[PDB]
Amino acid sequence: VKPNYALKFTLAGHTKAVSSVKFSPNGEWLASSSADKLIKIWGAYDGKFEKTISGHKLGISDVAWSSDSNLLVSASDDKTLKIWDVSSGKCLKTLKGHSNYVFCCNFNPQSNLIVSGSFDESVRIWDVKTGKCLKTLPAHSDPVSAVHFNRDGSLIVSSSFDGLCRIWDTASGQCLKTLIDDDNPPVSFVKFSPNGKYILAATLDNTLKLWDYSKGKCLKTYTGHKNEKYCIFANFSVTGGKWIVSGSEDNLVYIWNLQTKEIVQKLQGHTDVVISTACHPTENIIASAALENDKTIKLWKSDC
Amino acid sequence: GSARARPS
């Protein structure tokens, strides 16, 4: 059984590299962030451009949706995050306190907290309502490439160029687990599986790994793509077949069977590094986005 | 640019 993703829409309008695309939890929208300092909102099913959200002074590296699809948070080279009301497009809060580029961000499922990672090597936990920084975790010894809450918000997973993935207790800020690899390649991406029991970690040696973190054991390895230079978003695809989806520095989207680790599809058409992929919450739809030579978002649709 | 769009 293999998916049959086919190109449906190419979304143009960003004027520099796209950095991140995310589907809204309610499935209605795709949000894209860009080095061009802008957030754009697109219709998930018809690809229709909806609006541009602006205000960051420098380029954006990540954007994330609140669980009710009403808010966005963005992470910028200007050292801030911004919380945006999607309906109005207005900046509700500017989150200040990182001392270098903010690289990655996410809401917790309750969506009263934001977690951020920065080139300043810290992970910060913020109050959505007030914008207060509640905790600063000295998480890593090099830039922090990804931050993600587990299903109930009780854990945070972070990854860094220092070669580590760390699991943190949200309430206390204490590190509960550090996964290490003897070769210590930079960890460029990490995220919890939908059920929260596993983590998917990218390393800059062209490798994705599925870890059981309750046991600290690597259960699967996915290869064949190119990933040596960029922090490329990867995903669990669960609406149809159980896949792993990732961008790649050879301009393709890679899709693997999660259990067998075989590549089941490669999506061709981008003209630069596919820096970001996202999977729709209910339909077999992938959004992909690429760097400076391309600047576009593509929407792909599969029967399974 | 943005940090995510720059190679390491």
Residue numbers in the entry:
A (entry chain A): 31 to 334
B (entry chain C): 114 to 121
Wording from the paper:
WD repeat-containing protein 5 (WDR5), a core component of the mixed lineage leukemia (MLL) methyltransferase complex, directly binds to kinesin family member 2A (Kif2A) to regulate these mitotic events. WDR5 has two distinct binding pockets: the WDR5-interacting (WIN) site and the WDR5-binding motif (WBM) site. Emerging evidence suggests that the non-canonical role of WDR5 in mitosis is mediated by its interaction with Kif2A, a kinesin-13 family member that specializes in microtubule depolymerization.
Additionally, waters 7–9 are absent near Phe133. Intriguingly, the WDR5 Y191F variant exhibited a binding affinity of 0.96 μM for the Kif2A 114–122 peptide, demonstrating comparable binding strength to that of the wild-type protein. These results clearly indicate that the hydrogen bond provided by Ser121 regulates the rotation of Tyr191, acting as a switch to open the S7 site.
